[model samples]
Target: MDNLVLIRMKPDNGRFGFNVKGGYDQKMPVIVSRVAPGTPADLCVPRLNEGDQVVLINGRDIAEHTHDQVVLFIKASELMLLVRPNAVESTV
Candidate 1:
């Protein structure tokens, strides 16, 4: 079984922030590193958590794309995500 959470979030030119270091476990890609204060990501409806890995974008799985490509995908006006929670610490 997989723990999946789907959400749709809009960008405010304050795109989703996350970590995607190379050589890491490929099982998860979109790892939420941190959210900037006062940014749209910080004000998300369902809110996002650090360590959450995004597996989909706009209903499409982005696991095949590179890190930079994924960043651009998140910058879209309206974005959808399929995320897997790793070690969530808090929500805002």
Candidate 2:
């Protein structure tokens, strides 16, 4: 299953204006984490979700990049994202 999305933003005062958290367990991928209401990230309607894992940025495969690197990539005035719902174990 593929669920990718593109999110573009222009930082205000050097801040990409959002927050994210990645799983330290290695099994867990990076998540959108947070987007405060009324914030720039929130303005981008249908904003990223709490459990969305980032798979790519600007066509660069970020599945292997560190969370900090991902953040830096977003530092640009525009961004392209490839995201999907967190990988979930099936009971089947």
Candidate 3:
């Protein structure tokens, strides 16, 4: 099962990640534990830097996910999500 979710927060913030609680694999703070070929996200792998911010709207959730968290499903341009991460620009 492929449940799309949004990538909230920037990697620079330390807590960079996606909002996948209930989807393909059962886990909180949904992270890409594994990616397979042909998957929406997997298709963009390698190019997908670990810190890119992405928002997945109209995303699919498996089960037991947090309702308190923002719904993955989105409409308009906010449908489905995939991002290429990048390092946060440091400030001195």
Candidate 4:
């Protein structure tokens, strides 16, 4: 199974407190690089982790975005994500 997950969080300070890696232009799906401790993202359910691919942002596809663009997309105060857990069978 693909094991898709939904992670939702709202941050008042405009900092979701996470970083992203990968890029569509680079022929890669955007991935979560890190989630800072005690930050909104870290405090959210379905816990975000390093190397998880972000399949969607706020229920919209992110296939056309660059890595930084995806980062900017995630910077929104109200955030939601559809992620494929790190190092799973999704690559195959």
Candidate 5:
């Protein structure tokens, strides 16, 4: 939907400022499970948050990646993410 967007974030101290759940093995959508304050993931303009699916990292699709593998991507410098925000999962 309209909530789907590409976000560019640079983590602080290898902290992308967010935690994700789900993976290729879990057959999940690599959802954003958490977002910490004061981090690039939280401080960004659109406010990347939970319930958002991690579609891509640095322009590379991670739909087939595992949770830890996805984390490594976030550790990459100048991180860019394609997120699909889900209203239901947000629950906030």
Candidate 6:
């Protein structure tokens, strides 16, 4: 599926919502889990970490997943990879 985007977020823990091109909207509730390294999901979302919220466009929620379990999937026209603004980046 196209027209999809994955966003990384943290628990505002108050209430959560997203800002799409259309406008800001309440986020769909989801159960968060940690993904392991060296798996397909990991390969796709290598930068993902604990407490990161994954936003889906033309996508759906993942069930039967647990912490550090590995990988989240999405179906969309396109997927966008996001990183935390405060996160450090190294070329090496």
Root-mean-square deviation per candidate? 3.5, 5.6, 12.2, 4.0, 2.9, 12.8
Q: Rate the local accuracy (lDDT) of all candidates.
A: 0.63, 0.62, 0.33, 0.78, 0.78, 0.33
lDDT of candidate 1 over 1-92, digit per residue (tens): 18677666666545554444321234445677776676655677666666777777787777677766776666653667777766645443
Write the residue-wise lDDT of candidate 3 on 1-92 in tens digits: 23322432222223222333233233443333333343443333233223333333335432344433433332122134443233452112
Please give, for residues 5-71, the per-residue lDDT of candidate 4 as tens digits.
8888888568878888788878877877778999987777767787888888998888888887887
Kindly report which residue stretches of model 4 are placed more than 4 angstroms away from their true locations once superposed.
Answer: 88-92
lDDT of 6 at 83: 31
Question: How much lDDT does candidate 3 score?
Answer: 0.33
Which is superior by lDDT, 2 or 6? 2
Ranking by TM-score: 5, 4, 1, 2, 6, 3
Error of 2 at 64 (Å): 0.9
- Model 5 Cα lDDT, one tens digit per residue, 1-92: 46567777765756777888988878888988888878888888667878888787888888888877877777755677878877764423
Q: Extract clashing residue pairs from model 1.
A: none
Reference-based lDDT, residue 49, model 2: 54
What is the lDDT, from 0 to 100, of the residue 12 in candidate 1?
57
Estimate TM-scores for all models. Answer: 0.69, 0.69, 0.27, 0.81, 0.82, 0.29
Candidate 3 wrong stretches, greater than 4 Å:
1-28, 45-79, 82-92
Worst 10 residues of 6 by lDDT: 15-24
